[PDB]
């Protein structure tokens, strides 16, 4: 009947930002007011659309992307941003129309000694295009000499682990993000 936003937000496991998930949302009427009225979301940014007018609008393609980043990196999930997440992990277009939702998940994604299940890409030969996704693990060549599949000097594994710990500051605490894209293209 209604849109299954609950399965996105209430998911037990979340993806790393480099391998960010995505679900289609279509052929359903959504109750967005139950989401942007909840104080559990410390970050609820909507771009190119009034949040209180979401139910008065119909869209062609509505996607729900979810991943986990550190608190200091939620700033990069926004139109026209730069940084390791915006460039090498998850890029939003300048004409992006939708909402960005993020909440602190320290009690779920941290552990004493470090949670290593979440990673993010720290090196890449070029920036990503909007909504591109790269999941390669090729050794990144910083210098001029080729690496030949051996990690070392100027030869890095491209993915960095967060190592989430509960005693970290909120900037380095885990945050789960959900990006609702509202695209008004030419389609039924």
């Amino acid at each position: 009947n209604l849109c299954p936003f609950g399965e996105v937000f209430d998911a037990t496991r979340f993806a790393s930002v480099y391998a960010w998930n995505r679900k289609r949302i279509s052929n359903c009427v959504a109750d967005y007011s139950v989401l942007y009225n909840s104080a559990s979301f410390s970050t609820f940014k909507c771009y190119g659309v009034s949040p209180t007018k979401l139910n008065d609008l119909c869209f062609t393609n509505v996607y729900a992307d979810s991943f986990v980043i550190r608190g200091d990196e939620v700033r990069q999930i926004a139109p026209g941003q730069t940084g390791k997440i915006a460039d090498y992990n998850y890029k939003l277009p300048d004409d992006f129309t939708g909402c960005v939702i993020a909440w602190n998940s320290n009690n779920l994604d941290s552990k004493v000694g470090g949670n290593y299940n979440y990673l993010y890409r720290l090196f890449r030969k070029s920036n990503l295009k909007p909504f591109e996704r790269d999941i390669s693990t090729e050794i990144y060549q910083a210098g001029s000499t080729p690496c030949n599949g051996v990690e070392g000097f100027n030869c890095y594994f491209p993915l960095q682990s967060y190592g989430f710990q509960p005693t970290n500051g909120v900037g380095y605490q885990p945050y789960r993000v959900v990006v609702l894209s509202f695209e008004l293209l030419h389609a039924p």
Partner: nanobody, 126 residues
Framework: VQLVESGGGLVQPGGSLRLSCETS????????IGWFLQVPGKEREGVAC????????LYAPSVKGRFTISRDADKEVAYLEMNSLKSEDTGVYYC?????????????????????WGQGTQVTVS
């Protein structure tokens, strides 16, 4: 997590030095320890590099055989032995740490991947 450094100062061409790095608060299971040379007007370039669980090291070609990174008996202090000091070794030396995925190598010449940094200590070879 704080990294206090000590051991810098003025030294002779061909002299020795040993830098300290108080690894207090490091509560991660798998992490790296790196030493970085900061030259005025240059990118910060790592020279030494080790991971905790293994002790496996990694060095820069400019310092290979001359510098040596190690830890303490109680594993609370990280050291950087500096032998045969050239003038091109002059600059600020920071020790840094960061999470390192298990079964992977630490990264030296880049400062990326290191979250915690020391205040830095100047080493002038003259």
């Amino acid at each position: 997590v704080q990294l206090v450094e000590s051991g810098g100062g003025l030294v002779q061409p061909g002299g020795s030095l040993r830098l300290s790095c108080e690894t207090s608060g490091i509560t991660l299971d798998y992490y790296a320890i790196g030493w970085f040379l900061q030259v005025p007007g240059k990118e910060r370039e790592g020279v030494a590099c080790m991971r905790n669980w293994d002790g496996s090291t990694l060095y820069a070609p400019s310092v290979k055989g001359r510098f040596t990174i190690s830890r303490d008996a109680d594993k609370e202090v990280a050291y950087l032995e500096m032998n045969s000091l050239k003038s091109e070794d002059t600059g600020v030396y920071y020790c840094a740490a960061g999470p390192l995925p298990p079964g992977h190598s630490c990264r030296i010449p880049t400062p990326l991947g290191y979250d915690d940094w020391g205040q830095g200590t100047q080493v002038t070879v003259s």
